Structures are given as structure tokens and as C-alpha cells.
Amino acid sequence: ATQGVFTLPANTQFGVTAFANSAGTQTVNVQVNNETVATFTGQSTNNAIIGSKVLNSGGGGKVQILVSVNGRSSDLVSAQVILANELNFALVGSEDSTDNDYNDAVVVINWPLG
Amino acid sequence: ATQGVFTLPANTQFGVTAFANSAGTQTVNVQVNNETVATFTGQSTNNAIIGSKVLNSGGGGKVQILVSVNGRSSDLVSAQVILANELNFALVGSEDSTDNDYNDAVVVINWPLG
Amino acid sequence: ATQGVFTLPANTQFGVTAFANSAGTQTVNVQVNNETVATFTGQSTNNAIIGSKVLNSGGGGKVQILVSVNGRSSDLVSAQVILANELNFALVGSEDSTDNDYNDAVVVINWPLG
Amino acid sequence: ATQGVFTLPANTQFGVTAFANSAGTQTVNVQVNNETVATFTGQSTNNAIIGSKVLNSGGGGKVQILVSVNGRSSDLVSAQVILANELNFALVGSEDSTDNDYNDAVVVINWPLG
Numbered sequence: 001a002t003q004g005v006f007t008l009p010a011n012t013q014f015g016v017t018a019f020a021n022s023a024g025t026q027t028v029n030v031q032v033n034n035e036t037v038a039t040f041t042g043q044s045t046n047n048a049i050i051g052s053k054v055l056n057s058g059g060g061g062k063v064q065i066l067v068s069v070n071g072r073s074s075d076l077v078s079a080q081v082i083l084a085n086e087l088n089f090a091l092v093g094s095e096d097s098t099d100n101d102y103n104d105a106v107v108v109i110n111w112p113l114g
Numbered sequence: 115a116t117q118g119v120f121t122l123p124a125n126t127q128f129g130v131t132a133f134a135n136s137a138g139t140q141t142v143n144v145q146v147n148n149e150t151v152a153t154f155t156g157q158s159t160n161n162a163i164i165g166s167k168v169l170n171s172g173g174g175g176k177v178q179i180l181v182s183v184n185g186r187s188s189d190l191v192s193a194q195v196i197l198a199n200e201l202n203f204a205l206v207g208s209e210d211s212t213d214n215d216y217n218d219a220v221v222v223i224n225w226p227l228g
Numbered sequence: 229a230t231q232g233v234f235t236l237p238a239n240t241q242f243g244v245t246a247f248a249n250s251a252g253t254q255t256v257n258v259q260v261n262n263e264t265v266a267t268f269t270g271q272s273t274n275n276a277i278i279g280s281k282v283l284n285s286g287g288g289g290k291v292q293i294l295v296s297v298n299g300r301s302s303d304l305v306s307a308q309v310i311l312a313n314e315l316n317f318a319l320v321g322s323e324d325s326t327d328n329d330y331n332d333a334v335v336v337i338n339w340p341l342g
Numbered sequence: 343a344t345q346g347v348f349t350l351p352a353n354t355q356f357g358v359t360a361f362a363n364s365a366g367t368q369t370v371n372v373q374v375n376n377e378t379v380a381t382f383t384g385q386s387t388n389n390a391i392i393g394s395k396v397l398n399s400g401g402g403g404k405v406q407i408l409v410s411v412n413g414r415s416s417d418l419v420s421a422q423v424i425l426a427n428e429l430n431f432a433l434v435g436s437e438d439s440t441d442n443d444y445n446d447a448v449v450v451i452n453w454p455l456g
């Protein structure tokens with residue numbers, strides 16, 4: 001039911017990177033424990049990286065991605081993958097229109113860092 | 115060591131189910147916190163279920179799958195996928211020969227239950 | 229996003245297995261190229277396998293999982309993951325009520341076989 | 343190699359993005375149908391992007407990632423995940439030493455683009 005919400009280990013540094021593939025200017029909001037900590041804005045139809053930041057998951061470890069285009073919330077898809085019981089990817093696609101490529105904004109969260 | 119080991123939430127019920135797709139008789143050992151708690155043995159080239167059990171992850175939450183054929187450890191491949199930040203799959207494939215279909219024994223761990 | 233729909237290679241044997249974790253009796257329908265080829269019905273709150281079958285993907289490769297409880301459609305979550313570029317899992321979780329554990333029927337599709 | 347090799351749909355544009363999390367300088371080589379078409383070199387312990395390109399998977403679709411540190415091949419872990427039967431991620435972790443964080447170079451391949 002929930003898409004684009006992930007429970008990270010507490011107080012963990014993570015990377016968050018957003019790609020754009022749409023005619024529409026993407027706005028990507030990163031909320032940690034229900035507070036906006038990063039906003040990425042930009043327009044590309046060729047997978048430009050419109051932001052890449054290192055954030056901290058805080059006490060609650062809650063990380064939510066929200067995507068909007070010209071004030072309209074995009075439909076999200078997401079999952080988390082763990083490799084070798086250690087390397088974590090939290091993955092978000094988003095759809096701003098009708099073609100259902102779900103790539104309009106793509107967000108990759110990765111941890112651990114360092 | 116780097117594949118077929120999964121850290122589950124402590125004290126959690128989970129399912130483990132093994133399928134066989136090989137000429138060779140598969141043995142799957144399930145260790146929970148470094149103790150063997152279930153063993154599945156069988157032969158099938160048509161995806162037969164050679165065992166399914168509900169176990170508890172215990173204090174440490176450590177679950178390790180070992181696969182061997184005729185006393186020879188198989189090469190493993192594994193990942194964990196989480197859907198909707200809630201539904202967990204720990205997946206193992208194994209290879210007992212040279213064709214690298216990694217389906218000789220296939221193990222699926224799922225939680226939560228109930 | 230459509231969920232529970234997977235494009236397989238054409239004319240390929242796969243396995244499909246369903247587990248139940250609900251007070252409600254689950255009915256899982258498997259559609260291959262828009263025709264029902266398997267129906268699994270059962271009831272368990274302890275991960276019982278309510279069905280397992282070997283099918284062929286046919287000419288179009290389209291496999292769709294539908295889940296219902298007492299004739300009412302469950303909400304689905306899904307993803308596909310590929311290990312070692314060869315071993316394929318298509319995963320489905322489903323929700324029949326309000327608790328959002330999405331394990332009420334759990335469906336696992338695996339290929340290749342043999 | 344059984345890791346870091348992916349069969350993309352033929353003739354498809356994809357993104358490839360590498361991040362570094364190691365004291366050692368990472369060299370990521372991207373081979374498309376067995377030709378090297380990108381080389382990313384850099385050093386970061388804080389998830390800096392050391393490269394990002396848009397490439398075409400060509401007639402055979404084969405994409406391989408190789409990672410080395412001062413001429414020494416790293417151990418790889420990898421998987422592909424598909425959301426909504428449409429949005430694809432091929433994911434690579436690599437380990438250059440003994441701690442098994444598998445984040446020393448992290449490579450994300452995404453498609454479709456546009």
C-alpha cells in the first residue's frame with residue numbers, strides 16, 4: 001500500500017540520487033522522520049542527475065520520497081533490495097503522465113556509506 | 115559466508131520452502147543462529163517441493179541456507195527483496211554443476227506470517 | 229502501476245506456488261496470455277502452500293496473478309528479481325483487509341526449471 | 343563471471359552511474375557486447391559519483407561491469423530488479439578488501455530512459 005517509504009537502520013548515513021526522464025520539471029522531496037531535508041528540482045529527458053546528497057536516517061530511520069510535477073503528485077513504485085546481507089538499495093520510480101514508463105523521476109537510495 | 119545468509123528481525127516466524135531442478139539429489143540445510151533446525155532432501159527435474167517449514171528466527175535472527183549435492187557444497191546466489199516496506203523475501207539459487215542455471219535447489223524464505 | 233503482471237520469455241516452463249496467511253480463504257488465479265490456467269484455493273494463518281504447479285508461458289509470455297477472497301479482489305504488490313543473470317523470481321503479495329501486511333496470499337513464480 | 347553481467351533488451355538506452363565508498367581509487371569499466379565503452383575512475387569515502395553516462399545496449403544487449411583497485415579485480419555482487427513489469431535496475435556492489443561492506447564501488451544501471 002505504502003510506496004516510496006523505507007525503514008532504514010537508525011542514525012545511518014545514506015546516499016540519495018535522483019534522475020530525470022520527462023518533459024516535465026520534476027520536484028523530488030526527501031523526508032526523514034516526516035521532515036523535508038532535501039529537495040531536488042530539474043528537467044531532463046536524458047537521465048540527468050538532478051541531485052545527489054548524503055543524509056542521516058536519524059532516530060526513527062524513516063525515509064520517504066515524494067515526487068511532484070507542476071504541483072501534481074506522481075504515482076510511485078518502489079522496492080528495497082539487499083545484496084550479501086549488507087548492501088542496501090531503496091528504489092523509487094515515478095509516473096507523471098499516461099505512458100507508464102515510471103522513469104519520470106527515478107530515485108536510488110543506497111547504504112551503508114564509507 | 116557472503117551468500118545465503120540473512121539477518122531477520124529477532125524472534126520472528128518465517129517460512130522456508132525448497133524446490134529441486136537437477137538430476138542430483140539436493141540437500142538443503144537451514145541454520146538458525148548457527149544451528150541446523152531443518153534439512154530438506156529430494157530429487158526433481160520439475161520444480162518439486164522437497165520441503166516447506168515454518169521456523170522462528172530466534173534471538174540473533176540469523177538464517178543461513180546451505181545446499182549440497184552428494185556431500186559437495188553447491189555455489190549459491192542470493193538476495194533479499196522487500197515490497198511495500200513490509201513484505202520480505204530472502205531468495206537463494208544454487209548450482210551443483212557447470213551449466214549455471216543456479217536452479218538446482220531454489221530456496222524461498224518469506225515473512226512476516228499470519 | 230499494474231501489479232502482478234510479468235513478461236516471461238515465450239514458451240518457457242515456470243513454477244507458480246501460493247502461500248496463505250489470513251483468516252480468509254484465498255483464491256489465486258493464474259492467467260497466461262489472458263486465459264486462466266490455474267486456480268489455487270486454500271486457507272491458512274501459518275504459511276501453508278495452497279497450490280504449486282508447472283505451467284508454460286505460451287506464445288506471448290504474459291503471466292498475471294489475481295487474488296480474491298470471497299469473490300472480492302485483493303490489492304497486490306509485486307516485483308521481479310533476477311540472480312546471476314539467469315535465475316528469475318516474480319513475487320506477489322496481496323492484502324484482503326485493513327492491516328496492510330500484504331501476506332494474505334503470497335505468490336512466487338520461478339524460472340527456469342529443469 | 344556470474345556477477346555484474348546483465349542481459350538488457352537489445353538496442354536500449356540505459357544509464358550507468360558509479361559511486362565510491364573506499365580509501366582506494368576505484369576503476370569501473372563498462373563493457374557493452376564485450377567492448378569497453380566507458381571507464382570511470384575516482385576516489386571517495388562519502389558516496390561521490392565517479393561517473394555517469396548514457397549508453398546503448400546494442401544488438402546483443404550484453405552489459406558487463408568490471409571493478410578494480412590499483413589493478414586488482416574487486417569481488418562483485420549483483421542483481422536485477424524490475425518494478426511494474428517496466429522499470430529496470432541492474433545493481434552492482436564490489437569489495438576491494440576484507441570488511442565485506444560491498445560498497446567500495448556501487449554501480450546502478452537504469453532503463454528505460456526518456
Ligand SMILES: C[C@@H]1O[C@H](CNS(=O)(=O)c2ccc(/N=N/c3ccccc3)cc2)[C@@H](O)[C@H](O)[C@@H]1O
Nearest residue numbers: 135136137138139159210211212213215218342
Ligand atoms: C538435469 C541437470 O542436472 C544437473 C546436475 N547433474 S549431476 O548431478 O551432475 C549428474 C548426476 C547423474 C548423471 N547421470 N547419471 C546417470 C546416467 C546414466 C545412468 C546412471 C546415472 C549426470 C549428471 C544440473 O546442474 C543441471 O542444471 C540440470 O538440471
Ligand SMILES: C[C@@H]1O[C@H](CNS(=O)(=O)c2ccc(/N=N/c3ccccc3)cc2)[C@@H](O)[C@H](O)[C@@H]1O
Nearest residue numbers: 228249250251252253273324325326327329332
Ligand atoms: C488473521 C488475519 O486475517 C485477515 C483477514 N481476515 S478476514 O476475516 O478474512 C477479512 C476481514 C475483513 C475483510 N474486509 N472487510 C471489509 C470490507 C468492506 C468494508 C468493511 C470491511 C476481508 C477479509 C488478514 O487480512 C490479516 O492480515 C490477518 O492474517
Ligand SMILES: C[C@@H]1O[C@H](CNS(=O)(=O)c2ccc(/N=N/c3ccccc3)cc2)[C@@H](O)[C@H](O)[C@@H]1O
Nearest residue numbers: 114363364365366367387438439440441443446
Ligand atoms: C575506508 C575503507 O577503505 C577500504 C579499502 N582501503 S584500501 O586502502 O583500498 C585497501 C585495499 C585492499 C586491502 N587488502 N585487501 C586484502 C588483504 C588481505 C586479504 C584479502 C584482501 C587493504 C586496503 C574499503 O574496503 C573499506 O570498506 C573502507 O571503505
Ligand SMILES: C[C@@H]1O[C@H](CNS(=O)(=O)c2ccc(/N=N\c3ccccc3)cc2)[C@@H](O)[C@H](O)[C@@H]1O
Nearest residue numbers: 021022023024025045096097098099101104456
Ligand atoms: C517525454 C515524455 O514526457 C512525459 C511527461 N510530459 S509532460 O511534462 O506532462 C508535457 C506534456 C505536454 C506538454 N506541452 N504541450 C503540449 C503537448 C502536446 C500537445 C499540445 C501541447 C508539455 C509537457 C513523460 O511522462 C513521458 O514518459 C516522457 O518522458
Ligand SMILES: [Ca+2]
Nearest residue numbers: 066067073074
Ligand atoms: Ca509522489
Ligand SMILES: [Ca+2]
Nearest residue numbers: 075095097229
Ligand atoms: Ca500512472
Ligand SMILES: [Ca+2]
Nearest residue numbers: 096100101104
Ligand atoms: Ca512517464
Ligand SMILES: [Ca+2]
Nearest residue numbers: 021022104456
Ligand atoms: Ca519518461
Ligand SMILES: [Ca+2]
Nearest residue numbers: 210214215218
Ligand atoms: Ca545447474
Ligand SMILES: [Ca+2]
Nearest residue numbers: 135136218342
Ligand atoms: Ca538445473
Ligand SMILES: [Ca+2]
Nearest residue numbers: 324328329332
Ligand atoms: Ca492482511
Ligand SMILES: [Ca+2]
Nearest residue numbers: 228249331332
Ligand atoms: Ca495476513
Ligand SMILES: [Ca+2]
Nearest residue numbers: 438442443446
Ligand atoms: Ca570494503
Ligand SMILES: [Ca+2]
Nearest residue numbers: 114363364446
Ligand atoms: Ca567501503
